[PDB]
C-alpha cells in the first residue's frame, strides 16, 4: 500500500519517526513513507502488531515497543533511532486514545492518564528530536490534531482538550524551534473510516452504515475519508514541497468542520 | 473599594461568583468588581495572608477560601463549602495559573505535570464541580481565562501557552456539553495586562520596565497600556444577562496586540 | 424598549450613527442607545418608517433618509450629523440586504448591487466619521458581521462574501485608525428572530415553527435569539467598558457557529 | 523550462488548468509548474507581450489568452474558449489581483469599485463559469489566492486586504455550494513572496531592498525568504488527487509571518 501514486524524491532516505504506528492511521503513515523510500521507525504499545508490520515492510522499517506515557521509554526509543540512522528528519506525533467518556464522570486519575496518552508525549518527543534536528539545521514535526474541538464536539472532553492543546503547541514550538530550521505543523483530520471505528458495530451494520451516511450528509464532499487521505497530506507536510510552511493547521476533513 | 467601572448591571446583584487565583492581580480585580455590583463573591488563593487582607477590605459579601488548585479534592471541598453557604454558583471564573518562563530544552516531566496541574486541570474540575448545581437551577455562566500568547505563537513558556490553548478548546466543547442545561461558557482572553506583580519584577531596572511597556504600546493598535480593570469590565459583561445568548466564544481584550 | 436593565453612564450624550436604523436589528440599536441617553442619528431607505421611529423616540433621535448605495448621500448624512451634534462617537455599520440568491444565477449587475448595499457603504462611512473622531482623539466603529460565512452557508453568495470582507476590514482599519484613538470591532450575530424573518411565512406557521425549532436544536443554548441580544452586545462595544478591545469579532450566536 | 519541484504528480497529467494573472510573478510560476507536470495550462493576463513570451517558452501545452478580468463578458469568453479547445476545466486558480498601496483617506468611490473589480469580482465569475462543466464531469478543484495581509490586520491597502478577506469567506460558502457536484475549493494563502516585480520597485535603493528583506526574515519563524516556487509547490498539491478530501480550507505558506 503506497497510499498515492505521487513520488516525492525529497522523501528518499529521510528518517521518519511515527508514534502509534502499528495500526490505523499511523500504520498508513508507516506504509506511505516506506513506499517513498524513507527510513521509518515507529512506536506502538502493541508489540505483536508492530513486529508483524515491520517484518512485512522489511529493513527500511524499524519497530520499537513503547508506552508513550513512559517518557523515559519514549526518550530511549528516540535515542535508539538516532544511533541507528542519525537525527530524525520527520517526527509525526500520532499516538492518541480517543475513547468516549461522559464529562460528569471523569476522575482526576482518568484526566491525568488521558492528558498523558494524548498530549504529554508529543511535547517530549519534540524535545527529544530537536537537538539532532538543530545540529543538522533542518527537520519537520507534524502533530496530529482533530476537528472535534473546533466543532465543540461533546462526550470526550480529555481527548478534545488534548487536541486543542496541540493546536497551541504547534504555533509556539514553530517559533521556538524555527530558528534552528525546524518546521512544525498540525495535520487535522475529519472523520476517518478505520477498521477500529468500524469494529465497534460488528453486529449492527445498519447502525454503522447510518452513521457513515450521516458523515457524508454533513460533509461538503460526499464520500468517506480514510487513512490514505491522511497519509497523502502527511507526505506533503514532510517533503521539501512544504519547506516554507510552519505554525499552521492543514485540515483534511471533506468540509465536516464547516457546517 | 474599587469599582473598576461606572456601569451598573442589576442582573449581577446577589449572584454567587467564584474566582480562582482571586487574592492578587487580575483575579483581585474580578473579586473587587463583582463585589461592587452587589454579587456574593467567593475566591480561592494559595496566598492566605493576601486573601484574608482582600476579604478584610471588601467585607461580608466576600468570602476567602485558602486553596491549592493542584489539590483537586480541596478544590472540590472549596466549591461544596460555597454551595452550602450561598446556594449553587451562578458564575465561575477559572483564573488561577502560573506564567513563569521556561526554555523548551529545560522542561522535565515533573515540571510539565506540575504546570498542567496549576494551569489547566483545575479549570476542568471546577467546571465539573459547579455544573450540577447550575443545571438544577437551569442557568449559569463559566469564564475560562485564556491568553493571546498561544495565538501569537509566543516562545519560551510552552507549558503556560499549551495549557491556555487547551482551555480555548475546552470552552467550545463544554459549551455544547452544558448548554442544554442553561450554562454558557466563554473564554476571556487578555492581552498584555499591566499588574503590580509584573511590575515588581523590575524594581531595580525602571528603564527596562518603561522600555518593555512602550514596546507593548508600539505593537498594539491602541496606544495605551491595558490594566486589570480592562479585564474586569469584560468579565462583568460575560457574567451578566447582557451576554445571555453568547457561548462557546473567545472575547479578546488586547488593544490589538494579537494582530500584527 | 430599553433592551436591557444595565446602565452605562459612559454612553450618555455620545453621538451614535446607525445605518439601516428604522426596522429590525438596527431599530433595536436606535432604541437601546436612546434609552442610555445617547444622541442617536440613524439612516434608512424607508422614510416613513424612519420618520415614525424618530417621532416616537423624540429629540435625542435624528432620522436622515439615505440610500447607502449613494455614497454622496451617505457623506452628506454624516456631515449633517456632525454639524448638528459634533463628531460621531460611535458608528454602527448595519445596513445590509440578505435576500437568498442561487450561485448559478447571479449576474454582474446583481453582484455589484449586492456588494454596494452590503459592503461598500461600511468603508465609506468609516472614512467619513474618521477625521471627526481623530480630531477628538477617540471613537468606536462596530461593523455588523454574520456567522453565515464562517459556517460556509450556501444560497446567498454576495451577502456572505460581503460579510467576510467586513471581517477583514475590521482588522485592517483597527490598525490603520487605532493610533488616532478609534477602536473597530465586528458584532457577529447568529440566527436572530425578527418580524421580517417571520413575515416570510405568514401562511405556514408550521413551517416557521419547524425552522425556529431547527435553530434551537442546532444551537448550544436552547432559546431563540432576538434583536435585544444584538443590542446588549452593541451597548457594551460602544461603552468605555470595551475601551481596550479592537480588531476583534464578538459573536452572539447561542453556539450556532460551532456544530 | 522551470519545474519548481522535483515531485511528480501523475494525477496532474492531461488535466486542464486555468490561471488568471498568469504571465508574471506567482501566476507565471503556477503556469510553469503545471506545464512541467504535463497539464494543459491556459492562462489569462492583461500584458499580451509578457503572455505571448511565456507561452513561447512553454510551447503547445500552454495557451495564452489576453484578458482584462474587469471585463466579465471577456472573462467568460476566455473560459468558453478554453472549454471548446480542451474540455471542462479541471483546475481553476483565481490569482489576478492588484496590490498597490493607498491610504484610507485617499480612496474615492471610483478607486474602490475598480479595485473590487480587479481583486475580487472576477474570482466569483470565473468559479461560476467553470462550475457547470466541472459538475457535468463530477469533479474539479478551485484555488482562490488569499493573503495573510488581512489576517495580520495590515494597514494602507484597504481595498486589496478587504478583497482578500472576501475571498476567504467565498472559499467556505462555495465549498458547500459546489461540493455535492464533486468540486473542492480551497484558498492558497501566501506570506511575503520575493518576486522580480516586488524587486524592480527598489532598483535604485539596494540597501532599502535588503533591509526590507531581512525584516521579513527577522519577523518570520523560518529564516529564509519565500519565493514563487513555494507557492507553486503548494498549488500542485491543492490541485492533485493527493488533496481530494480537502475543501473549504486555508493552506498558508508564509514561514510563520502571520503568527507574531
Numbering used by the authors:
A (entry chain A), C (entry chain A): 2 to 260
B (entry chain B), D (entry chain B): 1 to 260
The publication says:
The sulfosugar sulfoquinovose (SQ) is catabolized through the sulfoglycolytic Entner-Doudoroff pathway, beginning with the oxidation of SQ to sulfogluconolactone by SQ dehydrogenase. PpSQDH is a tetrameric enzyme belonging to the short-chain dehydrogenase/reductase (SDR) superfamily with a strong preference for NAD+ over NADP+. Kinetic analysis revealed a rapid equilibrium ordered mechanism in which the NAD+ cofactor is the first substrate to bind, and NADH is the last product to dissociate. Structural studies revealed a homotetrameric structure in solution and crystals, involving cross-subunit interactions in which the C-terminus residue (Gln260) inserts into the diagonally opposite subunit to form part of the second shell of residues lining the active site.
To elucidate the enzyme-substrate interactions of PpSQDH, 3D X-ray crystal structures of apo-PpSQDH as well as binary complexes of PpSQDH•NAD+ and PpSQDH•SQ were obtained to resolutions of 1.7, 1.9 and 1.9 Å, respectively, each in the I2 space group with two molecules in the asymmetric unit. Size exclusion chromatography-multi angle laser light scattering (SEC-MALLS) analysis detected a dominant solution state species of ~119 kDa (monomer molecular weight of 28,000 Da, confirmed by LC-MS analysis), thereby demonstrating a tetrameric assembly of PpSQDH in solution as commonly seen for members of the SDR family. PISA (Proteins Interfaces, Surface & Assemblies) analysis shows that the compact tetrameric assembly of PpSQDH subunits buries a total of 13,974 Å2 of solvent-accessible surface area, which accounts for 29% of the total surface area of the oligomer. PpSQDH adopts the classical SDR fold with a highly conserved active site architecture comprising the Asn119-Ser147-Tyr160-Lys164 catalytic tetrad. Each subunit consists of an N-terminal Rossmann fold with a central, parallel β-sheet (β1–7) sandwiched by α helices on either side, followed by a smaller C-terminal region. We observe an ordered region with a higher B-factor (residues 195–218) in the crystal structure of ligand-free PpSQDH close to the C-terminal end, which corresponds to the extensively documented substrate-binding loop of SDR dehydrogenases.
